[PDB]
Amino acid sequence: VQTPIAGLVELALSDPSLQDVIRRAADRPADLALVGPASARVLVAAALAQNGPLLVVAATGREADELTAELRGVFGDSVALFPSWETLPHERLSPGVETVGARLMLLRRLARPDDETLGAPLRVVVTTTRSLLQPMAPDLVDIEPVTLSVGAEMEFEDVVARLVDLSYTRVDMVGKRGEFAVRGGILDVFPPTAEHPVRVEFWGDEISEMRAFAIADQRSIPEVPVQTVVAVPCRELLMTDDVRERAAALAAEHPVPGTVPDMLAKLAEGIPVDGMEALLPLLHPIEPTTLTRHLPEGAPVLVCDPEKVRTRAADLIKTGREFLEASWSTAAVGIDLEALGASGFVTFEEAREAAREGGHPWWTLSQLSDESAVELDIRSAPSARGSQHNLEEIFAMLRAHVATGGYAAVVTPGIGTAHRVVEQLGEADTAATILEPGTAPKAGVVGVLKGPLCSGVVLPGANLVIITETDLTGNRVPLALTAGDLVVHDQHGIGKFVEMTERVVGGARREYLVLEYAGTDKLYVPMDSLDQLSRYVGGEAPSLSRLGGSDWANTKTKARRAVREIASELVALYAKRQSAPGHAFGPDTPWQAEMEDAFGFTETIDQLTAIQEVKSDMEKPVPMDRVICGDVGYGKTEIAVRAAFKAVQDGKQVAVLVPTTLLADQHLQTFTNRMAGFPVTVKGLSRFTDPAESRAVIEGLKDGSVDVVIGTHRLLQTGVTWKDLGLIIVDEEQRFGVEHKEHIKSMRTHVDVLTMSATPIPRTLEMSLAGIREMSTILTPPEERYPVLTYVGPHDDKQVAAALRRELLRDGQAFYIHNRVRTIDEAAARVRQLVPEARVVVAHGQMNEETLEKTVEGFWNREYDILVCTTIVETGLDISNANTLIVERADTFGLSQLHQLRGRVGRSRERGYAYFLYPPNKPLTETAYDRLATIAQNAGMAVAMKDLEIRGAGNVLGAEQSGHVAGVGFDLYVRLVGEAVEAYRAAADGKKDVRIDLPVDAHLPPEYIGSDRLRLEAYRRLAAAADDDAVASVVDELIDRYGPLPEPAQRLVAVARLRLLCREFGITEIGAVSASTVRLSPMVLPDSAQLRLKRMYPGGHYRATTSTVQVPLPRAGEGVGAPRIRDLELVQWVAGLVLVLNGKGQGDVDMSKF
DSSP: OOOTTHHHHHHHTTSHHHHHHHHHHHTOOSOOEEEOOGGGHHHHHHHHTTSSOEEEEESSHHHHHHHHHHHHHHHGGGEEEEOOOSSOTTSSSOOOHHHHHHHHHHHHHHHOTTOTTTOSOOSEEEEEHHHHHOOBOTTSTTSOOEEEETTOOOOHHHHHHHHHHTTOEEOSSOOSTTEEEEOSSEEEEOOTTOSSOEEEEESSSSEEEEEEBOTTTOOBOTTSOOSEEEEOOSSSSOOOHHHHHHHHHHHTTOOOTTSHHHHHHHHHHTOOOTTGGGOHHHHSOOOOBOGGGGSOTTOOEEEESHHHHHHHHHHHHHHHHHHHHHHTSHHHHOOOHHHHGGGSOOOHHHHHHHHHHTTOOEEEEESSOOTTSEEOSOEEOOOOTTOHHHHHHHHHHHHHHHHHTOEEEEEEOSSSOHHHHHHHHHHTTOOEEEOOTTOOOOTTSEEEEEOOOSSOEEEGGGTEEEEEHHHHHOOOOOOOOOTTOEEEESSSOEEEEEEEEEOOOSSSOOEEEEEEOOOOOOOEEOTTSGGGEEEOOSOSSOOOOOOSSSSHHHHHHHHHHHHHHHHHHHHHHHHHHHHSOOOOOOSOOHHHHHHHHTOSSOOOHHHHHHHHHHHHHHHSSSOOEEEEEOOTTSSHHHHHHHHHHHHHTTTOEEEEEOSSHHHHHHHHHHHHHHTTTTTOOEEEEOSSSOHIIIIIIISOOSSOOOSEEEEOGGGGSTTOOOTTEEEEEEESGGGSOHHHHHHHHHTTSSSEEEEEOOSOOOHHHHHHTTTTSOEEEOOOOSSOOOOOEEEEEEOOHHHHHHHHHHHHHTTOEEEEEOOOGGGHHHHHHHHHHHOTTSOEEEEOTTSOHHHHHHHHHHHHTTSOSEEEEOHHHHHTOOOTTEEEEEEESGGGSOHHHHHHHHHTSSOSSSOOEEEEEEOSSSOOOTTTHHHHHHHHOOOTTHHHHHHHHHHHHHHHSSOOOHHHHTTTOHHHHHHHHHHHHHHHHHHTTTOOOOEEEOSOOOOOOTTTOOOHHHHHHHHHHHHTOOSHHHHHHHHHHHHHHTOSOOHHHHHHHHHHHHHHHHHHTTOOEEEOSSSSEEEEOSOOOOHHHHHHHHHHSTTOEEETTTTEEEEEOOBSSSSSSOOBOOHHHHHHHHHHHHHHTTTOOSOSOOTTTO
16 A cells, blocks of 8 residues: 655654653553544554554544544555444344454454565554454454465365355355355355455366456456465354354254244354354353454553543443344343343443453543643644635645745645645645655645545644645445246247256257246257247236247237337437437536536546546537436436536536426535536525525526526426526436426427436347437446345344434434335334334325425435335435335335335445344245345345336336236347337348257266356357357356366357358258268259269268258278267368358368367
8 A cells, every 4th residue: 555644744753742652652651641632643643653553442433444544644554444343242133244354354464463465564453442342252363264375285175165164155156255156176256355356276286376357247357466365254253063063952942034043043054144143152152352352462552532432332332232132032032141241342441451451551542631641732723614714824824834944734635636725825825736645745835745634733843734625625535047937938938947957869968948838848948049048027927828839929029019119219219319400519618627626536437438428419519318327326416517517618508307306405405516616506496495586596597597407397387498508407207297208308309418317227228229329327336335234034123123223323314114005104103102212204105295295305304313104205215314224014025126125225335224024923925935035145136136127128218018028028028129229220321040960069067067057158158159259258258267168168169160150151950860961951052062062072962952961971980880970070070061062162160179
């Protein structure tokens, strides 16, 4: 890492007061209380870090994060954070594996500071009060991790058992941390503390090569190198035999997913589960220690604001024991709580004494006075508080101080905001430069240094003053089929999946995908016709299976004829748009670039590339019609603010149409904030605004006063005018009424419009309408979203009260889902009864419109704490402060509905929690037990995410066509849409099988690809290739993911190129009557070619009525006549024959190596 403020903090250590605390602390006193500003806690930690390692305690997790960031800018990798659990010690939710990974990684780095592979020697460790008080087993650090380096001699099967012992989960394909996949001689693994997963390849019993790969495409990333990888545990325990028998003995005491015996049942088998972290007093009984024991001998502890630490310690212990009583009551189990109390938080004083008994001095740094403590010659910096005279004063203070001869520095944490400070100090008659990172400022010149610093510092002893940016502005910084699923075939129709079998027939082992029709008949799909299959989605009620008659071809012509209306209307809109006139927008105003600097975050590659795509067709004379795809939390609204600024800065006006007045208020706040500091007049007209401001300010638009307006369907009333409007922005267009979507659909050729949406479209659809509907989707995340912690189980009032109280404690909100409106007020009264300190309001669709928009207006404005709403209200609400979801009667919801409800919580830097609760008065049905278990798991959900694409397809195509999506399938429907849109788009400018049955053992061995879903995917991936460069990319993908191709795989791709050569000359079938002959079915031979056939292939004849060429197979050798040629030797012979029967002459062949 880089240390940008390392030289400025060293200049800060020029102060003899901190030099006094370095000398004073080198003698390791028992007590040492320090007084100073909060902005100095990075300086005093840097001071104490000069004599040896140091532990620093902060009250909150955020204060520890800010301190880790500031200290990291000083010592680099020598500073690390010991994170706090996102759960309580006895809560039945396990913490995230990223946090337990970092925790145990740091404990190992503390025990092994000279280990290069772990990192630089730790100088400062920063932690919170929770991690300080939360005890832990003294043998966590002694758990041997899985170290993987080049040349290390481990045995493949042994490390797999070690990885499951470390609580890694063996899954089909890795996609999250803690998962590991196993191929032949290749195991993919994703350590919980790593940026990317690594692909380990062995040669015998040692690691041959190690590559880091990506999750999206599973392909290796060659631009990053790896030397060693350390696989720390994914849970804070080791899966041993002692915990397996102690769980089975505890299972004899208590012989559904959310039940205690279900945990112990899987713990008897050795499989970890959520909530396990509450049974260690019973699973691994051991005298628990605390964090200070793991620091090296003599390392001190510096507590920052001990008063705030004590109040936070009180709330933690109270919250911890509340979760213990709730999640481990006798009613919850259907277990001695005081044996579990050994793992719970210990008091502030028990932790302080434990630190002193272990050799670690307990020192404090506070900002409140004390005559007993040493005060530092340091005071905080002036804050501007959003004033201009404040800012001019601070600038005049820095100018006077450098004229003194003293040091001054403005530290900028933001990106692209240091030059602006240099300009602001030039405006204030003060010279200043941008300092190279790591250096200290020079006496007499104000130095602007980019670095992490939340607040400034004044050290008169060091003749130095630091101001930070916050001090000046005031703003902080794959087809998977299980037995019985319904699939569709393009040539036959709806069938039922049975199994996958392999039946060697004509001297070759072939795999077949067996299906079921009307239970009479089974269809055996070969591995080359897999492109004609797709999983049936679309019909909620499963339709009846088809047959071998002629009814399927009609439902396809019904599809196509229905699909053709869509494509025609879409190309007609594209033609009427590119043909009609449109006033283009000029180039970028100079102010536009300054606004791009005002963005307080880093742009994604997709955001910037989309930013150029929105600016291209605005600068072009074309009437714009583009949608922005990608779900919430991305840079979507930002591209709207720039497109709106570029349109206002060219004379035109902007209108922003939203379907909700909450979106009006949200986008208004986002727009006004960004376009401040510029003469961009912006107002808003929604449901809740008086006619005094509506009629006059907003609706009184004729003189061109308001440049940009964000409003609802109220902006579509008769009587609205726009003096030279040039841009229209519509977010979530599908949520308008039919009476209003006609208006927005009308205003498309007249004015450049730009729509926004979060419902995704399939990747096939986006490629299908690439020329008809201009589309710019973004997928690069600004910050990585970490998954919400999901508990599924029985409805218990004490657990519901603990989770709700845990949100209100963090000043957060919560969603409480109750779908039956007839009894929705009965549910709110129950929540008010459980949490009497919560503002609890309801919201549903059967409510009139004004109360609903007012109820959720208040909810967003934090006037209510819990919103008891229905499924359809909750999914259409962006409340970033609501990070707990509670769903009563979770068995009543489709899996896709649970995914959508869960998606709208925990989408920020603070982690969310979701509770899916079923009733405790009745036993669950046969439909729900596995669906809810499928939600607990981090392939059965893929059937529900394909649903979320269907609704998006109905919004971009403009029709539901529910009768045609079912009965032919949605995958077939998107492919018929793309074909009809390709025909109509081609008409707007004036413009199958290859059956091969040969004795060639060509298949993908299960030794090569064990997963059926992954092997079936590989079959389809090669069957769908078109040229030799495609089949070469499929082979490059297969050796990357699974290893070198075995002989049956090399033969299989060799046949794949044979089909591409067959189609090159239009051949449909190569088959063998027996061992003796071969027949090429569709081939017309001229007289000259018949002379070639009799010449070089004697014994072969040509049948002209069926256009087939029959040629006898040669023999392998000239021996007694036992072996007939076969396998790839035969493949090239056939490839040669077809080359000479067309006049090529065996001169362009490749299949020798495969």
